[PDB]
Design a protein around this nucleic acid. Structure first.
Ligand SMILES: [Zn+2]
Ligand SMILES: [Zn+2]
Lengths: 196, 65, 392, 286, 57, 49, 69, 289, 103, 97
DNA sequence: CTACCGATAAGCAGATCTCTCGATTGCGTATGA
DNA sequence: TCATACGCCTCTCTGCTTATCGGTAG
RNA sequence: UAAAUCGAGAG
């Protein structure tokens, strides 16, 4: 599961460029000019209206999710295959992912390089009524870190806020998994009763 | 006593009946029975405008922001 | 204690007998003023003397419950203090819980706990019933004493009010018992108070209670709901609609006394009242028993002010001036402790016990007995003819 | 209803929940969440508020969200401006944290909602009643412990670690980040390295283990008991494992594990246990 | 099960002789397939194994 | 279709209620029955069969 | 409960070493590692058996049904 | 699709294939022409003035700027005035009289032209209790009309009913059509999609839309207007495109059998008791439910 | 420059812009307490009854002071006046009631 | 209707109003009235910066009358608000690495 | 003019895999002891 | 005085079905 | 040997 020194250097250098991605995405969504400060009163007001509404929030979440997904794709592409301390076939994780024995490249990426952005239902993490995603974060925080985009990995561990966001995502996943099995049963039963 | 369409009694503070539904030329309070002549208040004018979130239109988004 | 506050706020339940005595013969006013639970003890057969001490280890081994005696003293009052007959009546063994103040392990050190066969670090918080451990699970309920702007389609859908807005408040009496008030909204420009005294629900115009709580003028209501917001045409129009609707529907109620009388004779059968309570008295009773209980009796001015605040909040909500409060967000939630539920159930069981003895007296009235309320023999005869197993 | 809201930060455990039908509904409390069970002394609070600039509610002529309605457990105490209400909220929190004012109990929750645009209804809300939810956090001024609740928390900035405190932003900080987790979630070793659907599986499964229920089993008549004959304290364990005195009830054993594909009798989830170890008492129970 | 939600029924009582012995002579008392880890990503188990080995040493 | 219930404990199911729902006679006793000569247990792997 | 007689992984007898380990910890100021090394437990499989033992038997013995408390 | 035979599906649309010779220009214009526009979509605000000096009601219908709304929605000031004077007041008076029945249980208007005065008098005669009417015949920016009413009635909101009337008023709409967006072509297919099903409307627009390849998401409308076999084809296509989007392959024999069973009577049947009773064997239905 | 703790004036609160004829007059009361005494203001007229109280839950926590100020001098004459919350009842409507019990 | 102990005040001091600005100062009970914005009084800091109806003694100085000219409202209103000290944290000892 | 025929508005009825444990079972009353 | 038998003792979807307000011919 | 309700679980 380890990386090389140069692989970690690449990963951290690319992740350093994700600091302003959230602010730029928010500014683009609110139609504000780029390079605007993250604490601009007009930007804060526009994000306030976006949070109050439910469609502007969805648009902003989709745009920021696309940006952070581009960032994580860059990180994974540059680091996963040619940054590992052990290479295939010596790397058992990589061999298992590539040969289809168990797991996949997304699992290997989450373990080794980046855990990506947490999506609850095609959307970022929920927001309080005060514009705060968590007590640890500013109101109307224009930061990908305070949007569910966790920069940690399961090899080096995840910070507390990232842990909370990932717990949210896991809970939604388990709820949907529980629901779908009961959902399909009535459809199958009616189909087979008529077509038996 | 008079703020909008409402008329209040300056003595007790009860809603006086609408002057357009009384005998005429005067209306009295239903509690103090004080004399309120129909003069001194004839323009019961209210101005109201719809909320900003009442007419969601495509041009509404583009006119601002 | 919560139990003492509950029996104090229960009040006295009154019955009459036919013995010509303005209303019906003499008066009986049964009430409870002290509920005491004792630590569990064993009679050891009939030996008695100094009672033995029971322990949870003994309860577990015997495969029975671990309960202590429950004591209530009845204030058998005849003709409003003419002749009072106090009597402490046991009500069976109330299951007590471990490590509580009414348990025998309340302050025992770990060495003593090991000596008494419990555990090195035994923790209570549970009841032993029929030799089987049990626990009253903590439940999440609405936050007390807070009016929350709530938007719900289930209001207009199958609601007597026609809107999906409202302002719900779950007030709790000082004896830890809840009574919720829903400030519904109507599409035609008025607000209807809603509550559920018994298992059924009732609706009352809000301005009714607004005038009934304290002596008020219509200008006072306008001031309370609109503070310097004279230019707010929305608020002024809604307030005018509400006041005109009240004056049109109830032109007779020009005074607090007669609006209270109307409330009283509207709520007379359900709020069980003897043929002694006047309409004004029973109206004040239902007012103190239903609307804004968390401010308690003798808080009519505070109830009036808080009702004005609730109305302003509802109008601001329907005007889009404030977001709805999420019922399921933990920000707007509290937890029912589990012992408070025990207190509520004890208060209701005491109420049912008092109503049962009064029903026995009424059955005696319907039949033909000596029915002398001043006779200790008759009082003990009617007290032994009613089930008293509150502990059971 | 089952969504993990961010308003449960430090009150409800994000991990501790039973996967399946009761998921999200049967949650558990954080191990440091104190539930108030008594009514705090709120007699002197109205007297303090009036001195701080609150106009009396009896004679105020004020209404609407444009004014900060100060309440105490559901009683309208007075009215004040929004900025003044914020100042009173901060001053009340300071006086509550510091141990000099007699009228203000530390358990009192000062919930303040500043004005916004179509936000929550504003006003200064004070609570001291029973059944409240309380959590200890470190008030950054005076470095002293403070008590907050869910209603007051969602409007206040609280850094998760002392290294992330920002200038003029954070006024509180968690004592440790690990007090937002429940028991059986703090006890999971290296819980920040697993997928969350595995931390929650471990939380659900730590209750089903055949450990030791108690030591007084000779004086109990329980219908069914699951006893582990020989348990061991973990080599790797959280600092809270001995804080709660959990070594009195060992739950399992330390086994020499080999992450190896050798036997061929374990692909999906199966496991292979040494025969000789089993014959030596490994994992025995009654 | 382990402390990271790794379920699994015991499959066979593998005799000690057939168990893969190490250089020091330690024959593990529990074998867990390496394929269980990539999908669940329970790296906490990997950290815990070596941390416990260092602690026991 | 029964009329008359003040408090009660449980309303006795009619003959119709014995044949109607998922727990009724049809879906529980002819569309699926408990079977003789059948076992059930936990599965463990075996690459040698 | 009481100390296992044999180490699970290999089979070395560690049932005669719990009291010695406790004495080495109490009387002398020996660390757990040094005490285990002195006892003769070189492999970590043997070391864990005495290092992580709980000894719940002492807690169990306080509940004696055949002696007056 | 399969288990309820929803004739009122949540999201009905058609696929309109544009001709190969029509560019994006004259296509977006066609979309704006076919899309539905409401009266509320163009009103900036309304300023209701109530006076009892008998119960008058002066409504000032502020409008969006002409140079932008006539380009966004392709609706002219003449059409705006026509729809107002023909439907807006007609609905407003009906709502007002219904409210009364239930209860009982910019400044240049003085400088006016002869044509405008005649129009105002005509609309006053046409409608019930309107005392004045004017329109911005040179800018299309406002439309005032007094609404003097009887003084015996109580106070009325006159704002939350004007909101509803504006939102329910139709400026230019074809039945069962809401919006017509122009999505990016999938693979060489110039596709125009709508938000509703009404085939006969697009049959007239042969110049822009190739009427032969009009395929709709809805099945009941396809069955009603094209026949049973087209309904079976669209059933198969809809039940397949959901699987394809989820990267799951189901052989078309299964979907063909399902569609043929669903349209075995020439009607859009379903797999429920309401589409089950037509069966020879009764025990099967009794065992079903 | 000179405070007057002794009862000189008092300020009431009926509603916004409460106006009464100049012939109307009120009477003041004073309980026999030590500090922060409760005040009751009484009055009557031809057909209206005027009354007021002071809320003890707030009158003992804050003080209200009236005063003057010269335009060219800082000489301020302090005057302490309590605040009374008041209500207005019509004399004819004050005795208005109904039947005790409706049979 | 005289409540118990609420004796009618025999006499009241004259309250001059003609001859001119009328202000209200909502002094907290803690502030000493006898001894007399960043004003400093006693040993604590304070913030100083038609609602009610005013009454004035009549000629008989045994009753209350509403003051008016030829009504009269207070020219200015002040509320002495008690303030505390909120000190900035020491970031050097707060942000421990 | 007025009856047959429709076109909503409202209410009504019926729906929304197996397996293992454990616990529990009513008041209310009224007359022969 | 007092026990066991008799008498009861509040936030989802699809249709179908009935009643009631409009219209056309005779 | 039953039958219903509630509670706790496994896949
Ligand atoms: Zn009056
Ligand atoms: Zn060994």
């Amino acid at each position: 599961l380890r990386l090389t020194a140069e692989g970690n250097k690449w990963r951290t250098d690319i992740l350093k460029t994700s600091v302003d991605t959230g602010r730029e995405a928010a500014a683009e969504v609110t139609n504000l000019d780029k390079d605007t400060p993250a604490d601009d009163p007009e930007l804060l007001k526009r994000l306030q209206e976006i949070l109050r509404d439910n469609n502007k929030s969805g648009i902003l979440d989709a745009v920021t999710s696309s940006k952070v997904n581009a960032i994580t794709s860059q990180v994974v592409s540059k680091c996963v295959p040619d940054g590992t301390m052990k290479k295939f076939p010596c790397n058992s994780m990589q061999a298992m992912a590539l040969s289809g024995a168990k797991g996949s490249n997304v699992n290997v990426s989450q373990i080794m390089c980046l855990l990506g952005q947490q999506a609850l239902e095609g959307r970022r993490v929920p927001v309080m009524v005060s514009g705060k995603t968590l007590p640890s974060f500013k109101p109307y925080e224009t930061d990908a870190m305070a949007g569910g985009y966790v920069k940690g990995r399961f090899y080096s561990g995840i910070k507390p806020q990232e842990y909370y966001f990932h717990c949210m995502a896991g809970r939604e996943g388990l709820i949907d998994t529980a629901v779908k099995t009961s959902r399909s049963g009535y459809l199958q039963r009616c189909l087979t009763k008529q077509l038996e | 006593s008079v703020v909008g369409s409402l008329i209040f009694c300056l003595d007790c503070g009860d809603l006086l009946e609408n002057p357009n539904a009384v005998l005429g030329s005067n209306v009295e309070c239903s509690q103090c029975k004080a004399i309120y002549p129909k003069s001194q208040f004839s323009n019961l004018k209210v101005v109201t405008t719809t909320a900003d979130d009442a007419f969601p239109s495509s041009l509404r988004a583009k006119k601002s922001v | 204690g919560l139990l003492n506050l509950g029996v104090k706020d229960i009040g006295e339940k009154v019955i009459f007998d036919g013995k010509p005595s303005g209303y019906l013969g003499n008066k009986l006013s049964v009430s409870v003023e002290q509920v005491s639970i004792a630590k569990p003890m064993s009679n050891d057969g009939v030996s008695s003397a100094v009672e033995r001490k029971v322990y949870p280890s003994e309860s577990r081994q015997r495969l029975t419950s671990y309960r202590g005696k429950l004591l209530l003293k009845l204030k058998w009052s005849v003709n409003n203090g003419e002749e009072n007959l106090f009597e402490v009546r046991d009500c069976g063994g109330l299951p007590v819980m471990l490590q509580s103040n009414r348990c025998h392990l309340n302050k025992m050190s770990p060495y003593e706990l090991v000596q008494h066969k419990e555990e090195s670090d035994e923790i209570g918080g549970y009841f032993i019933v029929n030799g089987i451990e049990k626990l009253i699970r903590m439940l999440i309920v609405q936050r007390r004493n807070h009016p929350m702007a709530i938007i719900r389609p289930s209001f207009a859908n199958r609601g007597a009010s026609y809107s999906h807005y409202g302002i719900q408040i779950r007030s709790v009496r000082p004896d830890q018992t809840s009574q919720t008030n829903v400030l519904h909204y109507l599409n035609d420009g008025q607000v209807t108070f809603r509550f559920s005294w018994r298992k059924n629900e009732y609706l009352v115009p809000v301005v009714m209670i607004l005038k009934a709580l304290c002596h008020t003028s219509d200008r006072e209501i306008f001031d309370g709901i609109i503070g310097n917001d004279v230019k707010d045409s929305f608020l002024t129009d809604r307030l005018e609609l509400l006041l005109r609707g009240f004056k049109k529907r109830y032109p007779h109620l020009q005074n607090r006394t007669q609006v209270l009388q109307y409330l009283g004779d509207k709520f007379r059968v359900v709020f069980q009242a003897s043929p002694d309570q006047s309409d004004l008295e029973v109206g004040q009773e239902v007012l103190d028993r239903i609307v804004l209980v968390h401010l308690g009796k003798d808080g009519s001015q505070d109830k009036f002010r808080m009702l004005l605040f609730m109305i302003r909040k509802l109008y601001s909500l329907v005007a889009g001036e404030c977001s709805p409060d999420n019922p399921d967000a933990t920000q707007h939630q509290e937890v029912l402790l589990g012992g408070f539920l025990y207190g509520m159930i004890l208060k209701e069981k005491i109420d049912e016990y008092l109503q049962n003895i009064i029903a026995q007296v009424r059955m005696d009235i319907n039949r033909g007995m000596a029915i002398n309320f001043k006779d200790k023999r008759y009082m003990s005869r009617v007290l032994m003819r009613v089930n008293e197993n509150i502990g059971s | 209803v089952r969504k993990l809201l961010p308003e449960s930060w430090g009150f409800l455990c994000p991990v501790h929940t039973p996967d399946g039908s009761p998921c999200g509904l049967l949650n558990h409390f954080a191990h440091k969440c104190r539930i108030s069970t008594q009514q705090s002394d709120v007699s002197r609070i109205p007297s303090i508020l009036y001195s701080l600039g609150v106009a009396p509610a009896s004679h105020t002529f004020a209404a609407g969200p444009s004014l900060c309605c100060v309440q105490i457990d559901g009683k309208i105490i007075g009215w004040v401006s929004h900025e003044q209400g914020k100042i009173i909220a901060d001053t009340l929190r300071y006086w509550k944290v510091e141990g000099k004012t007699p009228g203000l109990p530390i358990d009192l929750e000062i919930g303040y909602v500043p004005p916004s645009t179509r936000g929550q209804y504003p006003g200064l809300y004070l609570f001291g009643g029973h059944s409240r939810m309380l959590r200890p956090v470190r008030y950054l001024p005076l470095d002293k412990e403070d008590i907050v609740g869910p209603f007051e928390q969602v409007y206040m900035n609280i850094a998760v670690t002392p290294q992330e405190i920002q200038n003029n932003v954070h006024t509180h900080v968690e004592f440790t980040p690990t007090n937002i987790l429940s028991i059986l979630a703090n006890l999971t070793p290296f819980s920040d390295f697993n997928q969350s659907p595995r931390n929650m599986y471990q939380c659900q499964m730590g209750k089903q283990t055949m450990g030791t229920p108690g030591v007084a089993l000779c004086h109990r008549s329980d219908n069914k008991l699951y006893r582990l004959q020989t348990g061991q304290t973990p080599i790797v364990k959280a600092n809270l494992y001995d804080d709660y005195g959990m070594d009195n009830f060992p739950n399992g054993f330390n086994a020499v594990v080999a992450v190896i594909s050798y036997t061929g009798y374990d692909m999906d989830d199966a496991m292979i246990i040494n025969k000789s170890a089993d014959e030596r008492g490994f994992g025995y129970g009654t | 099960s382990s402390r990271h939600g790794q379920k699994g029924v015991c499959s066979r009582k593998w005799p000690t002789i057939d168990m893969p012995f190490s250089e020091t002579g330690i024959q593990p008392d529990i074998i867990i397939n390496p394929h269980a880890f990539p999908s669940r990503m329970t790296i906490g188990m990997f950290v815990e194994s070596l941390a416990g080995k260092a602690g026991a040493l | 279709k029964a009329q008359g219930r003040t408090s009660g404990k449980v309303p006795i199911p009619g003959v119709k209620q014995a044949l109607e729902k998922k727990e009724g006679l049809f879906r529980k006793h002819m569309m699926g029955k408990r079977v003789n000569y059948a076992a059930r247990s936990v599965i463990s792997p075996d690459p040698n069969i | 409960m009481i100390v296992p007689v044999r180490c699970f992984s290999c089979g070395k007898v560690v049932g005669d070493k719990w009291e010695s380990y406790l004495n080495l910890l109490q009387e002398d100021e020996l660390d757990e590692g040094t005490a285990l090394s002195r006892l003769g437990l070189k492999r970590y499989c043997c070391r864990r058996m005495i290092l992580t033992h709980v000894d719940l038997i002492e807690k169990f013995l306080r509940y004696n049904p055949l002696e007056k408390r | 699709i399969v288990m309820t035979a929803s004739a009122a599906i949540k999201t009905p649309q058609m696929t309109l294939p544009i001709w190969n010779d029509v560019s994006d220009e004259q296509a977006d214009t066609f979309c704006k022409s076919i899309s539905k526009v409401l009266l509320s979509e163009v009103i900036d605000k309304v300023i209701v003035t109530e006076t009892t000096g008998a119960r008058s009601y002066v409504i000032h219908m502020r409008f969006f700027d002409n140079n932008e709304y006539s380009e966004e929605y392709d609706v002219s000031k003449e059409e705006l005035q026509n729809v107002i004077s023909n439907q807006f007041i007609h609905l407003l008076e009906a709502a007002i009289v219904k409210e009364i029945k239930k209860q009982k249980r910019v400044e240049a208007n003085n400088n006016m032209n002869k044509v405008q005065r005649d129009r105002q008098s005509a609309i006053i005669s046409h409608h019930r209790f309107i005392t004045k009417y004017n329109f911005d015949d040179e800018s299309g920016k406002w439309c005032e009309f007094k609404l003097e009413l009887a003084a015996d009635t109580e106070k009325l909101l006159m704002v939350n009913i004007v909101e509803e009337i504006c939102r329910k008023s139709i400026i230019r709409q074809i039945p069962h059509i809401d919006r017509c967006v122009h999505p990016e072509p999938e693979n060489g297919k110039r596709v125009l999609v709508t938000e509703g099903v009404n085939f006969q409307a697009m049959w007239d627009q042969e110049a822009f839309i190739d009427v032969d390849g009009i395929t709709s998401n809805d099945v009941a409308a396809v069955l009603k207007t094209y026949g049973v076999e087209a309904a079976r084809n669209t059933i198969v296509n809809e039940i397949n495109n959901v699987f394809s989007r989820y990267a799951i392959s189901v052989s078309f024999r299964h979907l063909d059998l399902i569609a043929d069973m669903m349209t075995r009577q020439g009607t859009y049947l379903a797999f429920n008791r309401q589409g089950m009773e037509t069966s020879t064997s009764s025990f099967m239905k009794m065992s079903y439910e | 420059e000179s405070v007057q703790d002794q009862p000189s004036v008092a300020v009431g609160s009926f509603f916004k812009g409460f106006r009464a004829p100049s012939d109307t007059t009120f009477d003041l009361y004073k309980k026999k307490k030590s500090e922060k005494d409760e005040f009751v203001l009484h009055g009557e007229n031809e057909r209206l009854e005027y009354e007021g109280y002071t809320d003890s839950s707030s009158q003992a926590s804050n003080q209200y002071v009236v005063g003057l100020f010269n335009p060219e001098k800082k000489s301020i004459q302090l005057y302490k006046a309590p605040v009374l919350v008041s209500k207005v009842v019509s004399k004819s409507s004050k005795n208005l009631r109904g039947p005790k019990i409706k049979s | 209707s005289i409540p118990d102990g609420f004796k009618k005040c025999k006499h009241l001091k004259n309250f001059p109003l003609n001859g001119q600005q009328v202000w209200l100062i909502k002094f907290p009970s803690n502030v000493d009235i006898s001894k007399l914005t960043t004003m400093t009084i006693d040993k604590h800091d304070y913030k100083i910066m038609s609602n009610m109806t005013l009454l004035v003694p009549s000629e008989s100085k045994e009753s209350l009358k509403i003051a008016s000219t030829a009504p009269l409202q207070f020219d200015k209103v002040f509320s002495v608000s008690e303030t505390a000290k909120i000190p900035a944290i020491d970031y050097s000892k707060v942000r421990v690495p």
